[PDB]
């Protein structure tokens, strides 16, 4: 005999747990990253337009969208930072330039006037928010003072391995000298690295080592971590201290953004996805495709603007303007949250942590099935 | 000393279990799909022509073959639906057209006269059975009323994520308003989604999220499930309620059909396998191959007949007529059942559930060995 | 302080077990085949020329080399069977021909005169040994009687799924009617299939389903087994009855032969490795490579000499004469045994079963490392 | 409420263990090699220039860098050995030449005069250190006597499978006859092989079987081991006897060197990485790339300077001079140690063994993320 349909919801209670895995079950198949798993769908009872994407950048800075442009010389100068802020995220201006040049870029962002209600602006002056990267040697103290004079809102201490005495000393010096400046420390991939930087006074952490599209650190240094695993393990610790984390590297699509946030990230940082856009630095050139250069900051070319390279110089295809691309990401992330059944990124965090949001692993065959497969040809047009 | 051959069958009883895995052992290596495993052969004591492929589409509709054509605008209009029904399966007419156009397609199927004893026909009028897809917004109520007037037998509520209040409300409205119309709800991939739709009144479920050959939902939404795992987990629940399930997406060959049914599906739905056949919509074009367009219903092109695409536009090679292709699938499935040792799909279900039918995982090397390998060249001619 | 070198052998006794895995530990990572593991080296205290490769084909037939040519119409006619026997193995003549044609091929082998001390010959007449394949329908009774009149030594009952009532009845009929004829039954991949055929009276078993280079049975039927796993599980049972097994399909190189024997096979059968040799049937043709056709017996082309194909038609490159190729395999297998530390295939079996021979799994990265890697170009010249 | 940042280091003590895996947890996912895992970063509190790379070659020979050039006829003759020693490593001169020719090569190294403070030199004469390979048959006794007369410092007994009575007898004869000559035995991949050679009197071991870029031993012999697993398991035993081990084969980049040492190796041997350099034997030729031949010593070509090949002949691209390449490796390894948080290779060993250094597995997706990914094109320029 068959069960009565009227009892179907009640019958769920006979199972020991919800279908799929909790995030803890998932992350206990070690060394995973984003492509190794999926989020299972939930219950839809609201429109995607309802989904709020407010996200913490640092202890005191919140954005309307979890999107941060990388401090790379082929990704973020003033044009990128202005437009990222207008669209609800933020740009981190690179430091492969003189201190005077970098301060001028920050000034250009801070003085911009020409906006939507989601724009990233200071609460007092209503100027666009601006970030910038620096190193952690003594000369960077004067560089930072110039950036602060230019109106900097947040500084990123830029390193492939941020758990160093130099970086710790720089965090302490900044918190003493410029107490109102928010500091993002990193990069980190372990709980121990995170503890060290948090203890030094970081207002946020940048997570990732070797995941970048242009990065060869794992090959040449043998050192790094799979990105999803790094995000989970760092944020499981950092989130207890109210220290928001940026998932930096290895993001190529909306689903990576969703997954990074599911695993504990507060924001996501993009280099390659934003390289090749109109607002990135560098000129377009042709090959019969329209291209831009995109290069690691540890590439020989970037370092020269024996040397051991930790990144490569390459090219990416023209992506058009971020005035279309960022709204695509935003709308896509709203739709992703809707499918999962959550109405905000705050709720997404809460429901992952409670075990309400469920996950599944993907075997290599499942990854192939999940991608485009068994066509003679196709065009992958992502948005209109 | 060696054992006496006369004792060989008796000696089987000394083992703790049958060789290979039960379906429960298999599905406990998480995130698997069809290519990750095989069914082990059994005992042959009947001809393949003996195998019966009768399959439940919905609570009240049974087909002579477990084959359902997808409601896509490059797969199923009236020609496809007519021929699928003549061959013992069914077509689901797409809704990327006006309600009047869709009702005319249904009418054409219902009025067709020109048949084999396996044809899918109504028990009272002996008209070919016809299905059709609709959405779940308010305008779809009037669309459905027009399709019902045209003689529709089964409606498919068409969504990538069917566990929504809109779809639940539509199921309830249909069951009240058109009590004799069978309703297939979905798409679903979890037990909880299935419970929700069954409780609302669904007569069948459509299983799958992201497995389609033209689908990029997993990449862009981070949300979906490996198809084999979805089929198993949904049907383990749904089958208890006597709610038949369609395994939709990711089917490319006869073995996927066998595996879908082994894992609990009652029928299988095909888009890509049927695209490029004579009876599909759209014209052939050349490139030096003869091709047809095959596109996701969430492709920019289909949606336009910012937008976030969940499918792509592509092409597939000419497959010839389903008048040859469906008999190939049918005969092939008979042979597959024969190898496994089962005389009907009902028996296949029973013997999987009892642990008589056994399975084995396949490592990536085993998958390569199982495919064509180590030839200079080959032609893959599937049937004569 | 460091340990004294004089104690190093004694120190081995402090470990719980030998380094690496026993075959039981290996085969408990389910669904493996040959490329998934390696045999660990042992102690060399003899020359490779000492290694004896005597192998049981059936209960009453032993060969000097474990090499059997497949009964395929692009692999074994009389020329192949003659030369295989002269070199210490055997050929199985195909049956895609009339009974009169097949009997003439057998007669040609049995009447050949023109030899090395390892040649496969009958003990009474000193004629070359010959095998032949038949089907298991009623017409095959008269075919077999003609082959027996021609001097056949061993018959192979040819099927992709040999556990059938037709094959069981044929085994029983042969054992009654031609009691001195050795019968190899199959193909099988499970313990239960093996028990059924052994109980019927088989003198040997042919193991494999879907592993053949030209075979698509796993794709189209969903039914088969990874070859290494099939060999282990069938032979673990069959060897208890003194029923030798042929590991048939998926062999491409000497290491596959070693691994097949390690896992319990008594002999190995080759199609693709022997196709394209001078002694195989069919003419060479050019494309700018010299090629031969190699095709599955379930290909449309072979069957035609709706139809559901279970194999493909392809091509392989010219391999030269088996007068060089078989001695390469023989010498290579001697060297492989030497590396492992065993002086005969009998000893190899004994030392695997006792846990003296050890194994290791290979991750995909380990397989890539084990192959040729990181060269601009290379030539893979296997022998001089 | 959030935890106080001041407590972050203290909070680490609430976890059961450090983040990531100990080497024992890692090596318990069997059959792994270098690309399957990463080393997690530590704490940086020193400059990379502080890192010392002193490494034990044998019981009595220590080098300033862990780099050994392979005894192959396309890698190491006198030019390579001279320059390797000048740069702090050592060369092993090949023996595919007459004894007189080989002795002349050794003499050329020992008589060289033209140096940095890291040069590998004898403590008494201050001559460059030189190694050489020999076989283990009787004729090699006279060959070795000639090499000793020429001033040889270390002999490598050259075999793909060194656990043989011939090699054991050769070790014993050398230790008796030339007691001041250091002997490296091998190749080995198991604990049992290592015990046998250590007991015979080896001063060092050469680890690896089948991992070489030009090697096909695993394919043809079915015998070998994944390199990382071999290094771990051999050295776990050998290091207890104070017998240093060379990780030979499968090294392509700095990270493989780091990983080999992490797993217990004392030095690393390179063939392919050093082939194609100015100092390797053989002339450059063009194809529109500048190339050199690089070939296995078990290739038909090398053996001919039936035969069963265990290696291939190929080509590699011009790498320039080792006067730049070795300093790249040295500086890179210093940077790798810095990221991990260790100031010497001795410290690296100690901190791996204590569980302070942590590791992580990498799924195939994590390996793809760790490599260069999702670029239109790129150039992989490793150093300036
Ligand atoms: N159940 C439910 N579905 C909705 C709601 N709003 C939109 N949808 C559905 O979700 C899909 C995405 O629509 P969007 O949310 O982009 O407007 C559409 O098929 C739409 O009908 C809602 O409030 N409840
Ligand atoms: N190790 C390393 N990381 C880099 C380099 N250049 C950029 N990065 C990292 O790569 C990230 C961008 O990754 P993507 O978004 O392209 O995957 C940056 O935000 C930064 O973390 C480089 O040369 N080496
Ligand atoms: N044991 C057995 N084998 C059969 C039977 N019917 C067909 N076969 C065998 O199964 C294979 C497929 O034949 P088909 O079933 O397509 O006619 C053929 O080799 C055929 O001889 C049967 O009733 N019993
Ligand atoms: N998510 C998604 N699913 C699609 C889209 N178009 C078709 N589908 C699904 O893909 C199935 C066809 O998959 P196929 O048989 O080609 O593998 C359809 O029946 C439907 O479930 C699309 O654009 N997006
Ligand atoms: N220990 C040992 N090594 C041998 C013996 N015979 C041959 N070898 C070695 O094994 C390798 C293969 O030689 P083959 O066995 O092909 O003559 C050669 O390097 C050879 O020196 C033996 O009896 N004992
Ligand atoms: N299922 C199937 N097996 C085949 C077919 N033709 C040959 N075989 C199998 O493939 C084996 C040869 O495999 P190979 O040595 O080329 O890997 C044969 O001995 C036989 O077992 C075919 O069309 N279908
Ligand atoms: N914390 C710390 N960082 C250092 C030290 N020495 C160099 N670094 C940093 O490590 C990176 C590599 O520099 P190098 O060690 O090659 O000079 C640089 O960014 C440098 O600033 C040190 O003693 N302590
Ligand atoms: N089995 C085998 N090993 C080889 C052969 N030639 C070189 N080798 C090994 O390959 C190593 C070089 O590996 P590579 O650095 O190119 O990966 C050598 O040091 C040696 O151990 C060969 O023909 N066969
Ligand atoms: K897909
Ligand atoms: K195959
Ligand atoms: K190799
Ligand atoms: K990378």
Residue numbers in the entry:
A (entry chain A), B (entry chain A), C (entry chain A), D (entry chain A): 2 to 29, 33 to 118, 234 to 406, 408 to 425, 444 to 522
Give the article text.
Attempts to crystallize full-length wild-type AgIMPDH in complex with GMP were unsuccessful. However, we obtained crystals of the ΔBateman deletion mutant, in the presence of 10 mM GMP, which diffracted up to 1.25 Å resolution. GMP adopts a conformation identical to that of the substrate, thus confirming a pure competitive inhibition mechanism. Analysis of the enzyme kinetic curves revealed that GMP is a competitive inhibitor with respect to IMP, with Ki=600±100 μM, whereas GDP and GTP do not compete either with IMP or with NAD+, that is, they are mixed-type (allosteric) inhibitors of AgIMPDH, with Ki=210±40 and 160±40 μM, for GDP and GTP, respectively. We further observed that GTP and GDP might bind to the Bateman domain, because the enzymatic activity of a mutant lacking this domain (ΔBateman) was not significantly affected either by GDP or by GTP, in contrast to GMP that inhibited the wild-type and ΔBateman enzymes in a similar manner. ΔBateman and AgIMPDH displayed similar catalytic efficiencies, corroborating previous reports showing that the Bateman domain of IMPDHs is dispensable for catalytic activity. The association of AgIMPDH tetramers change neither the structure nor the accessibility of the substrate to the active site significantly, as the tetramers of ΔBateman-GMP perfectly superimpose over AgIMPDH-GDP.
